[PDB]
Amino acid sequence: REIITLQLGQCGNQIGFEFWKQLCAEHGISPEGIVEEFATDRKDVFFYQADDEHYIPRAVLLDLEPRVIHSILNSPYAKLYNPENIYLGNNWASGFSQGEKIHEDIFDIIDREADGSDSLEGFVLCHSIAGGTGSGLGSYLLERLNDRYPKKLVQTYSVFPNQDEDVVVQPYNSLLTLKRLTQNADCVVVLDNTALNRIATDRLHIQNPSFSQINQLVSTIMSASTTTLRYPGYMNNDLIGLIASLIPTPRLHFLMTGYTPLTTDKTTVLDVMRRLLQPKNVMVSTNHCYIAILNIIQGEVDPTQVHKSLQRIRERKLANFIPWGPASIQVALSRKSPYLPSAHRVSGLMMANHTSISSLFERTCRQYDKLRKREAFLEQFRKEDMFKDNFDEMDTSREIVQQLIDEYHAATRPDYISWG
Amino acid sequence: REIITLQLGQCGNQIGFEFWKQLCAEHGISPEGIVEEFATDRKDVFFYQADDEHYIPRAVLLDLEPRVIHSILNSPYAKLYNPENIYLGNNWASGFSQGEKIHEDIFDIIDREADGSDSLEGFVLCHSIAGGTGSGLGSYLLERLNDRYPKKLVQTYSVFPNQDEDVVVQPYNSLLTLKRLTQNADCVVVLDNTALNRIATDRLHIQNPSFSQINQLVSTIMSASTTTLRYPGYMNNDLIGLIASLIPTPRLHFLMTGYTPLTTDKTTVLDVMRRLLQPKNVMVSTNHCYIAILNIIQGEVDPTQVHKSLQRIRERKLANFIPWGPASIQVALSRKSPYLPSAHRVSGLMMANHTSISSLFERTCRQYDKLRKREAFLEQFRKEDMFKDNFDEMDTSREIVQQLIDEYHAATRPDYISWG
Amino acid sequence: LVSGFEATINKFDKNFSAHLLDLLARLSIYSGMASVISRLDFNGFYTERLERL
Amino acid sequence: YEALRHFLLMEDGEFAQSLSDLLFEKLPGELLNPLVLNSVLSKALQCSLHGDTPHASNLSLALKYLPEVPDVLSCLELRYKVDWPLNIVITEGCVSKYSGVFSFLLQLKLMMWALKDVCFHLKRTAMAGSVQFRQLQLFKHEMQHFVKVIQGYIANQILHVTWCEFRARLALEEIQRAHAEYLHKAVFRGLLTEKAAPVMNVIHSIFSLVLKFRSQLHPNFALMQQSYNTFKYYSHFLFKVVTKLVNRQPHLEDFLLRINFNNY
């Protein structure tokens, strides 16, 4: 079924903009949405088909107090995304309260693409945790979408902010988001501003313009995570059949990333799997262990080599699973697209469920616990206080995310057969 | 397991620089670090493998108040050694006290290569005895490394300074170094500035630029001492099996050097085994006796000649020894590399445990004893006095080195079964 | 709630695991080829449950 | 020929030093099913760093005996496999004698692993500096050098001098006869022949005493001191039994020179 992407907030609109521009270049699409004259892919899911081959993606752009979205509009690609669905504070509560009044018209914007498509399977959110306007509104929209579409599933391309810790209410905002996501998100893919920044300092000398260059690092992950859907294959030709292996239990739906050529500007499959399992290629910053690992490779890959590579990786033991289950490394293959550079002819990515991400959740929880004892930024603004007089949704969020931390470490324990 | 070399001090950084440049030439490496086009050897141990075949050495360069150290940086080979691990007095106590403050960051530099390699067996130090900044700092680092890494085995390519005896505190510095090295070095290979100088006067007319040319002699010794590790073998492929025959008792771990063609710029193995047992090719300046001898030959050696040659060397009896150890001379064979010239293709080196190095230790001990009676250079600098008010680590060093001298002469005695 | 469901769960889980044993063990007598066992039985999981004879 | 030498005669390093090192980590019902021994070779060719060719396959790591339960014996074969137009030259009885020399070479690898384990096991004991420590470690140095010289003998004869012949000798019936001479010199110089068999019989006493030394890893010092004295007596007997067999074989002339160098 066709995927509708709900990019929201300034940062999320930036990454959705870059994601659709990269799919414009990767597919046979021009900046005006026209089919390219120079051009074998499954473009049905991600791009709506007009009769004059206007491949307009099913992007829903939400602007709240818009600045960046004006710059999005004065672009050469403004004709490419034309489904005409752009509708006009730094606190979570301000974003939530601003979303509540316009929920019906933005939901009618959801409804129109839902009717216009043949079918719809997932809502993929370019969400920003603690992103001022994006946070809060994304949590509220996340809460509305599962009620209105109970059979349907929601993915979150969460850019989890770690910038070495400006937003002084950032742990509070992030805390409330993670409660809303843990109960009301089917899947979450996590990304880290510090980890992408350390990889920026690794592969290049870029330090000060960190966000603009990390946009490309995020967009390569976001494209390679969907390439096996966007191009056909033997297996993983549906989002949901991909999703089920990555998420074994519903509470732990958070997925780490990695890329074998971080400098993607011949290599055998044994080499690229071994390089992927090393921590320098991972883009995420008591025993600890994976719950399940998957990998997808795109390029000039020899077919009988990959099973010998799986045996070889099994003997290398660069990462060991040891959960309660039979989870194994799962090899998958896709085709690199034409017309774009085939540099690093073999190139791959991994998605995995790892217990190390609980430490990162605990970090903003620790910052929140210290800030909550101090009460230095309760904000006391009349929006904040009139919205939450009790300030107990932060405590419900704390107990829910503490359940999540305990569930992660219980998944590390030998007995997750009992209740976690 | 992979070897990490800890080159420190100005003289030690010079010889490590030349050692890695020679291995760049001898192996298939270019000054950028990448493999050359024209290039069956074991380059795994000494050279890290990057993704695009940038064989970077696992060299750790330590500098201290660098002025001439920048000459290493403005070289064509600066891209070859790129692990980015270069971190910013003529007294032993000054070097020790300067190393103590930066020990944690230089040890993190050790830790990073420790994690980055698959495995680690040894720390091979390009140490300079009484080398101003190199001495003291090398003793302190040698004391830290066995505590932190007790499983690994430390080698020391000590360039023992004998320049016909400017440093006026040189016996004090060398005295403290030898205490630290006897206690905290698993093996030491000794070299002599006057012996390499007399060899320079023998082979060429070079007298005034002695250091710059002796660098090449030291580098030939340093390369041929590890050639059987760097190139594949049937035996002694690990460093430990090589080391254990050379060092029979833990206290006497000091190893003599010599090279068969004193000018290498056909010969049977009878001749090239004979030439090692001549004192003109030895590179080191009561009965006295070897404790165990080993030799390694290079090139396309005729092998039934080595039956004849071992029986011939036994009948010749040019090497006189009768220690407590069994002391059979062991013969080894290796291949000359397919890049470097084939002129003098047969070419050999010896490493041996000899009691005559105790005389050289006693020489700087005698200089120290005279200087210690005079107290002419106690230095009285506030670093030296505040670091060592008792001046009793010099006396502890004197009793430890005197134990070493007595142990060498007891090794000459027929009863080293009893305590030496 | 569980009287009708968990009774069907355990009898199916025991019947799944037994036929999962019999698939692995009857493929293990087949000495590429034996790797379908060691893929199914990855890093320590269900590679030693019941030794036949 | 130059590939079967890389695998069977253990010439290629990091392969025997991994296959033997993997097998010796375990030591009955285990280590004999085809789940571990038929897979340890597919684990060992990966860390060979030389091979993974069409020649590198057909290495059937099979057995020929079922052991029940301190000795120096672990019977295990390693057979190459060929196809039709090469099976007519490499005879099916030649590879059996390859197995016959292979068991001895693997048994030799057992010594340099277990003695390395007692050299490494004492390293963690180090403060404890006294009589009973240094006089004990002198025994390890005295016993290691014997293995390290008999292995150097083997490593000069069966891999180098018998490989200079049959390499410069070749360059259809002559291929059969030359191969049957190359192997026969490899097993003649290896002290596996029944003519020089008492010389081989003394080596088992030496190897068994080093294994007993590995057993006692200072609660029982004198129990090990007696074992060292028995070792020294047996080596001193080997030097006489090799000298008496000089009058009755130029291959053994290297051995007295290897074992005796400035001693008696």
List the helices and strands and how they pair.
This is part of a larger assembly, with 2 copies of chain A (420 residues), 1 copy of chain C (53 residues) and 1 copy of chain D (264 residues).
Chain A: E1 2-8, H1 10-26, E2 47-49, E3 55-57, E4 59-62, H2 68-73, H3 92-116, E5 120-126, H4 134-148, E6 153-160, H5 170-184, E7 187-192, H6 193-203, H7 210-224, H8 227-230, H9 239-246, E8 254-259, H10 269-277, E9 290-299, H11 305-316, E10 329-334, E11 346-354, H12 357-374, H13 382-387, H14 393-412
Parallel strand pairs in A: 1-4, 1-5, 5-6, 6-7, 7-8, 9-10
Antiparallel strand pairs in A: 2-3, 8-11, 9-11
Helix pairs in contact in A: 1-7, 3-4, 4-5, 5-12, 5-14, 6-7, 10-11, 12-14
Chain C: H1 6-28, H2 35-40
Chain D: H1 4-7, H2 16-23, H3 37-44, H4 84-87, H5 94-121, H6 131-164, H7 173-188, H8 197-215, H9 221-244, H10 253-259
Can you walk through the features of this model?
Chain D: It is found in: Cytoplasm, Cytoskeleton, Microtubule organizing center, Centrosome. Chain D: This is Gamma-tubulin complex component 6. Chain D: Belongs to the TUBGCP family. This is part of a larger assembly, with 2 copies of chain A (420 residues), 1 copy of chain C (53 residues) and 1 copy of chain D (264 residues). With 420 residues, chain A is an alpha/beta fold. Chain A contains 14 helices and 11 strands. Chain A has helices at residues 10-26, 68-73, 92-116, 134-148, 170-184, 193-203, 210-224, 227-230, 239-246, 269-277, 305-316, 357-374, 382-387, 393-412; strands at residues 2-8, 47-49, 55-57, 59-62, 120-126, 153-160, 187-192, 254-259, 290-299, 329-334, 346-354. The termini of chain C are far apart. Chain C contains 2 helices and no strands. Chain D is an all-alpha fold and 264 residues long. Chain D has helices spanning 4-7, 16-23, 37-44, 84-87, 94-121, 131-164, 173-188, 197-215, 221-244, 253-259. Chain D contains 10 helices and no strands. The chains are: A alpha/beta (420), C mainly alpha (53), D mainly alpha (264).
